Design a protein around this ligand. Structure first.
Ligand SMILES: O[B-](O)(O)c1cc2cc(CBr)ccc2s1
Ligand SMILES: [Ca+2]
Ligand SMILES: [Ca+2]
Ligand SMILES: [Ca+2]
Ligand SMILES: [Zn+2]
Ligand SMILES: [Zn+2]
Length: 227
């Protein structure tokens, strides 16, 4: 697409003045998207790429095009598209945060655990002391859906919310990989994510281009048929 930039195996698309989407491919060639946020004098990353080499490519692109230190990364669940690059984040000295449940499931899912655990209230909001100096990232656990551990992130100051692999696009035909999914609670979880970030108009997700809020309602409608 016009305006996109390629660095090695990675493609970046600016979504807002201080937000970019990172896309990595794993062989057909499957795309996974995460986010890069410029918060003042530092950078925040949401999700790794599929692999350590791909994740290092994100870090080098950030140094070349943004030239600000990467303070921390939040990863959205314990699967390869979201945490495959944890060793690269650790080698680069980036503090890593995941849901505690993602850190618990990580060895069983073949992932490396993050250095810190985020915990959540009954209402899905992160307990603030487990998310120190997160700037505009607002972390919400919507309930089990794509996986039991899936978390979501709002970028405060923007129109952007990230559903990760929980949300799928509004023309989708399936919910994608349901092997570790909670079929009963998925619809409610997708709706809870839309309610958490009621004013977000750009919904970014792992396996499609950014969509409108129609991705949330469409994903919930498809999920209703699993219960
Ligand atoms: O459930 B999801 O985090 O969306 C994953 C999709 C996927 C695909 C391959 C081969 Br292409 C290997 C690992 C994973 S994980
Ligand atoms: Ca590794
Ligand atoms: Ca599994
Ligand atoms: Ca039940
Ligand atoms: Zn997954
Ligand atoms: Zn995924």
């Amino acid at each position: 697409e016009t305006g996109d930039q390629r660095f090695g195996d990675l493609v970046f698309r600016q979504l807002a003045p201080n937000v970019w989407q990172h896309t990595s491919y794993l062989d057909g060639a499957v795309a996974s998207n995460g986010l890069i946020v410029r918060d003042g004098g530092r950078v925040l990353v949401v999700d790794t790429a599929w692999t350590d080499d791909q994740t290092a490519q994100i870090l080098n692109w950030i140094k070349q095009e943004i030239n600000l230190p990467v303070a921390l990364a939040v990863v959205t669940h314990a699967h390869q598209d979201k945490m495959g690059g944890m060793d690269a984040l650790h080698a680069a000295g980036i503090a890593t945060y995941a849901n505690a449940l993602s850190n618990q499931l990580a060895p069983q899912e073949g992932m490396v655990a993050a250095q810190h655990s985020l915990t959540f209230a009954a209402n899905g909001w992160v307990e603030p002391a487990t998310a120190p100096n997160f700037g505009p990232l607002k972390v919400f656990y919507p309930g089990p859906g794509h996986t039991s551990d899936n978390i979501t992130v709002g970028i405060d100051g923007t129109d952007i919310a990230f559903g990760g692999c929980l949300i799928k696009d509004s023309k989708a035909k399936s919910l994608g990989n349901l092997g570790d999914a909670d079929t009963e609670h998925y619809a409610a979880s997708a709706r809870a994510f839309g309610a958490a970030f009621p004013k977000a108009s750009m919904i970014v997700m792992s396996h499609s281009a950014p969509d409108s809020r129609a991705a949330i309602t469409h994903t919930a409608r498809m999920a209703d048929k699993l219960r």
